[PDB]
Amino acid sequence: EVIKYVKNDRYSIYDLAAEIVGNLSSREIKEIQKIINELLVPNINQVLINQVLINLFAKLEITLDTREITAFTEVMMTNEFDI
């Protein structure tokens, strides 16, 4: 959902908000919107690691990564997996 909101251009923040654990999140979705709006810079080298790190600190379900962060990384590598 977060890669579909980032790379499309027009996907709403509430469409991404409609899956996080128990939802009912009002007034606090802009806190994560600022972080992922900082993800809209391309910056393909190394910023995805610490940005996704502070995102998973923000959104909980921590340490479900290491292999999965690389599996997520290889999608936007070369800026497109399938154009």
Binding site: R27, E28, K30, E31
Partner: protein
């Protein structure tokens, strides 16, 4: 005639900023509601006024001498004025959306004494309290910061209220 009637005739027919140095008691509510009634009678526009006191017993006395109106006048204390007209409608605009709207004013257990931890409390646990020193006001400082930081608060508070009555 004498001083009472000529002061009444001068004060009622004024239109500018007025400063009244009265005595002890003797019906300040009387001259207040007389000037309020005269100002509401002479005005035919959409603007309203705001009467400000400390005790709401004076507020219900003022509206009892006034009567009923649907123009949109505010009668009450300055804490309620700052809370409902500046802080609550524009706290989500002046300091970002992450600051919360719906909040409770409680000044019975709070004795924190800085602005930084004060708006940390207002952001994190959304309680507005009071300063530790008696000669301060966290609420009025926050209202001034909201008014200087938010455009739409200035537009609303200029487009609604015409005269403000301080006692």
């Amino acid at each position: 005639m004498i001083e009472d009637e000529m002061s009444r005739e001068q004060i009622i027919k004024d239109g500018g900023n007025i400063l009244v140095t009265a005595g002890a008691g003797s019906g300040k509510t009387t001259i207040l509601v007389s000037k309020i009634e005269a100002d509401l009678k002479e005005n035919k526009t959409h603007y309203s006024i705001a009467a400000v006191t400390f005790t709401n017993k004076a507020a219900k006395e003022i509206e009892g001498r006034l009567g009923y109106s649907s123009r949109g006048n505010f009668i009450g204390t300055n804490d309620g004025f700052v809370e409902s007209e500046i802080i609550r409608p524009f706290i989500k605009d002046a300091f970002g959306n992450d600051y919360p709207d719906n909040f409770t004013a409680e000044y019975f257990d709070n004795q924190f004494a800085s602005y930084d931890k004060g708006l940390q409390v207002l952001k994190y646990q959304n309680i507005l309290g009071t300063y530790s020193n008696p000669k301060k006001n966290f609420k009025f400082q926050l209202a001034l910061d909201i008014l200087k930081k938010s455009l739409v608060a200035r537009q609303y508070i200029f487009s609604k209220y015409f005269k403000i009555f301080i006692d």
